[PDB]
Scaffold this active site. Structure first.
Site, PDB file in Angstrom:
ATOM      1  CG  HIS A   1      -2.188   0.910   0.968  1.00  0.00           C
ATOM      2  ND1 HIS A   1      -3.601   0.500   1.158  1.00  0.00           N
ATOM      3  CD2 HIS A   1      -2.158   2.439   0.815  1.00  0.00           C
ATOM      4  CE1 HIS A   1      -4.164   1.570   1.027  1.00  0.00           C
ATOM      5  NE2 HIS A   1      -3.367   2.570   0.852  1.00  0.00           N
TER       6      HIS A   1
ATOM      7  CE  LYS B   1      -7.350   1.814  -2.123  1.00  0.00           C
ATOM      8  NZ  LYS B   1      -6.432   2.007  -0.976  1.00  0.00           N
TER       9      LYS B   1
ATOM     10  N   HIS C   1      -6.269  -1.238   5.776  1.00  0.00           N
ATOM     11  CA  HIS C   1      -6.658  -0.665   7.135  1.00  0.00           C
ATOM     12  C   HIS C   1      -7.502  -1.552   8.144  1.00  0.00           C
TER      13      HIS C   1
ATOM     14  CG  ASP D   1      -1.733   4.900   2.712  1.00  0.00           C
ATOM     15  OD1 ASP D   1      -1.206   5.666   1.894  1.00  0.00           O
ATOM     16  OD2 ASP D   1      -3.058   4.687   2.723  1.00  0.00           O
TER      17      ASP D   1
END
Lengths: 376, 389, 379
Positions: free
Chosen positions: C63, C188, C241, C295
């Site tokens: 990510h 995504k 997440h 991320d």
């Protein structure tokens, strides 16, 4: 490649004289010379026997519409026919023009398909004449060449310089530049209402000056569709190279014609015009041959010849209007005369064209750029 | 008028038999019959001597792209070419098709200029074969027939059913109706990624079952058959289960697809010539399969996808079909009878009473050398003689 | 070309074992083998001295947002930044990523400049990781990945599948096809926001089926429980997440095999300018598959290795964290030539100073980086 022509009579179109028992020597696509007698061929030399035929330069029509031909629903066809359909009709129109003996033509107005036709002919894909095309005619809003004229309001839109409709000097300059961008050879405008009206002038002096100067910048000549006297005289003073139809030509318009040196393309066949052309010829107007073919079935272009002689034009100068004058109006120096160093465009007819011009309505031999397209 | 063809050998493709020294009598565009011997011309009838020649029905190619032909600048020319230029090229392509002996063809994808070419040939404006055209191919977004594939993002736009791009059953129905509106004869879709387009992959199925169902049902309502270009096995099987009429290329065809072919009756068009033929293509750019297909009993119709290799060399494909193991007679049947069945025509593909005068002639026996069809010495379509050497 | 790496310790991630005093033989871009001892080079053979170093397969982050980096003007920047400016920043972001030792990344969201960035790296124009990019994320109208969210009414427009916004199954199918047309590697989507679920079951089915038709995996951003379970039933390949995860979602994870990408680093950074550590601890203890994801983009590029520390701090063993960056990542991507140093794999090799199984924080200073047989960092 070398080709020899055994010509019984070949026209020195400039010197106004027939040449008797002569031979034409062609190398590749260019006439290499004129030699006395019927020269027997050297090895590798192809020979065409035209000893019984009258031999002419390639004839040129300065007003043709190769995309279209007149039809019982010409106005309806403006709404349903697509570019490809027009191209497929244009193929036959171009070939018949070539086999009528008109090896060079000036396409004066179209939808842009004419530019594609010229490119296809030059690439060797389609049999046709040398085409010099104006692309889209330029007009003012509501002008004769306005494409959406008479339309329903929903479909009428606001045509602009990109579409060939210009108003004012800057838009005119841009319209000329756009025709240059599209690959047009020359510019054509409609200076008067032609065929809600048809003589009031549809171009201001400022617009005509802008167009003439722009065309001169890009090496393109200006041709003018003009029926009214006022618009015609505005165009003539603007510096245009040609006036077409001129149905109502004033005496002042003839004085302007001779002082400016512009050509008058009579277009009697599309038709007052017979009288107007006669008076113009008597007055000394420079004349170039034009049929406005399309309104008139393609391949019957030679008919115009007869009526111009019927208006009093001598046969020899009528042919000069189809040949030498045509090449001068085009601005090309390699066409319009059978002479050393010029391009191999050859026509042949059965009987003497100066004793009876109607023999040109049956051209028996047609050769363009050295290749024989018709030989009977 | 009336024309008699004096044929030394004339092929009855239905009986699989040569007829020796016979006369073919045609009035106008219809062959009125075949008579034994060289019938003497009665008064004012025209005679053509093919006594030293072998005479065939008009050959038909059921995968042609008459608008374009392969060249080093195809990708650039999609951005540089106008419709009229395409038409002027179409003139020469059609002429090469007709003089190769292919009197009938099915144009399987174009920009719509192919429809205009069909109308122009039928109007007598252009020399050409009988064209049955799908117009614009139908694809999904990013599909093989998606027109703006690989274009700049600004120039790519969002093509929709009007442009031949459909997503979902409703859009599929609308797109088929649009091809009907534009005048297309049949529907052609790309069920998997292809080879000459600028999509990344070339084997994933690009049509869902529900979308394909919409395509087939709409096509049947407006009476148009469906042809499906499919290289991947799964997309081909979806098309076969959907009820399509023909599958093109079929480069990766599975055995489940083979009995699917046999159960549905769909035709297989191999296009080996196209699937055979540096710095040339874009950066992201079957003989056994055909052998297995013929051995299995799959119905075969002749197709070259000429356009991707030059028009007029279509006959080359015949040779490949014989070298992959198909008998010469059945190759000729695939280009004649089977093609006429696939089109839905009953007056083409055979020299017999009541059919249209599409007649070809070659120098030597096509059953002993099919390669003789690469030099067609006589070509006649609809009664008019186009080639006579 | 042949290169020999004299590695003091080379970690075999599969057997979980350090190998001592070894040579890695690389020809071109592919690992040709592993030999005992430090083999001397013959002619045309080049040797890299990594004898004092610990050698690992190239790390992977599943990510990242290589188009952006977080910074006080992010909302304004989208309104003032052109594609070219974004690309010019992406250059430095990619270099910082590759030099930290992350030789492969999965870029999970962008404007499309990420696809051009991948193509530019692959062409050798710019130094960078192997990028697998989703292109533009797919969202529903007003969904989290809606490009014109919060816009002036003048500029908000009506974004559709071409722009990555879909409503209904046909639009979702079209949006997936458009991402394929643009050249994306994977799809995504954002299945939740705040926390409300923004994708219906039928839409998720359409997306999963279309993506599988074009051979692309689906990664799903979901913080709410409802969206996460809808996605897990649909058949997604990974959840990112997943901050609010129920014990049902945990049986869903275990039954489906989707990967869980925790992204603890971005949760801590947003908590700066908590629950996610608790969630990751519970997820790992329950047996959920874990793949490494930071991320970054939301955190500065080049600090990705920090995430490792936090996963060890939540209780995951160091070997399993390194496997989450290597073996598990390569499985989630669907590639069989990355994530392990052995014959037949691509020569993506990193080296650190000390034993990462004893202190994972040594991964914060990578002293050697080689991607595709080429050496980018050698200290």
């Amino acid at each position: 490649a070398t080709t020899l022509l055994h010509c019984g009579h070949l026209l020195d179109v400039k010197k106004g004289k027939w040449l008797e028992g002569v031979t034409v020597r062609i190398e590749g696509n260019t006439i290499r010379g004129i030699e006395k007698g019927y020269v027997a061929p050297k090895a590798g030399e192809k020979v065409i026997d035209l000893r019984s035929r009258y031999v002419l330069p390639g004839l040129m029509d300065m007003h043709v519409h190769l995309e279209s031909e007149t039809n019982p629903h010409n106005t309806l066809e403006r709404f349903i026919l697509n570019p490809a359909d027009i191209a497929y009709r244009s193929v036959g129109y171009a070939r018949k023009t070539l086999m009528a003996g008109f090896t060079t033509v000036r396409d004066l107005g179209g939808t842009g398909v004419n530019i594609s036709l010229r490119n296809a002919i030059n690439a060797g894909l389609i049999d046709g004449p040398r085409v010099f095309t104006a692309g889209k005619s330029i007009a003012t809003t509501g002008g004769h060449a306005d494409p959406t004229n008479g339309y329903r309001k929903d479909l009428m839109g606001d045509p602009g310089p990109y579409e060939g409709v210009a108003n004012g000097p800057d838009e005119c300059r841009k319209a000329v530049r756009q025709r240059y961008k599209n690959g047009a050879d020359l510019i054509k405008i409609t200076a008067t209402g032609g065929v809600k009206s048809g003589t009031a002038p549809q171009f201001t002096d400022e617009e005509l000056r802008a167009i003439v100067e722009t065309a001169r910048d890009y090496g393109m000549k200006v041709a003018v569709h003009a029926h009214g006297a006022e618009g015609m005289k505005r165009a003539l003073r603007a510096g245009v190279h040609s006036i077409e139809h001129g149905t109502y030509m004033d005496d002042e318009a003839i004085e302007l014609f001779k002082k400016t040196g512009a050509y008058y393309v009579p277009t009697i066949l599309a038709g007052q015009i017979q009288k107007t052309f006669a008076k113009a010829y008597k007055s000394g107007v420079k004349i170039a041959f034009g049929t406005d073919s399309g309104k008139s079935v393609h391949g019957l272009n030679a008919i115009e010849f007869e009526l111009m002689v019927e208006a009093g034009m001598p046969p020899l100068e009528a042919i000069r209007s189809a040949t030498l004058n045509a090449a001068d109006l085009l601005g090309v120096n390699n066409l319009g005369s059978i002479e050393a160093g010029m391009l191999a465009d050859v026509i042949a007819v059965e009987d003497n064209p100066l004793e009876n011009i109607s023999t040109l309505r049956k051209v028996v031999f047609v050769m363009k750029d050295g290749k024989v397209y018709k030989q009977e």
